[PDB]
Amino acid sequence: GSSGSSGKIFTCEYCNKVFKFKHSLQAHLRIHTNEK
C-alpha cells in the first residue's frame, strides 16, 4: 500500500514551500506577513 497521497498543490510566494491544501499554505503565510 502507498505511504501517502498527492495531487494539485499550493506554493508559498515568500519561500517557495509547497502544501497539499489551501488552508495549510494560508496559515504558513503568518510567519511572512502580519495583520492589524
Q: What residues line the site for Zn ion (CB under 5 A)?
A: 12, 14-15, 17
Closest CA to 21 of 9, 6, 5: 9
Q: Is 32 annotated as a binding residue?
A: yes
23 is in an annotated binding site: no
| Cβ 4 to Zn ion shortest distance, Å | 21
Give the rounded distance of the alpha carbon of 13 from its chain centre: 10
C-beta closer to Zn ion: residue 2 or 30: 30
User: Is 15 labelled a binding residue?
Assistant: yes
> Within 13 A of 23's CA, how many CA atoms are on the CB side?
0
Q: Where is the binding site, in residues? A: 12, 15, 28, 32
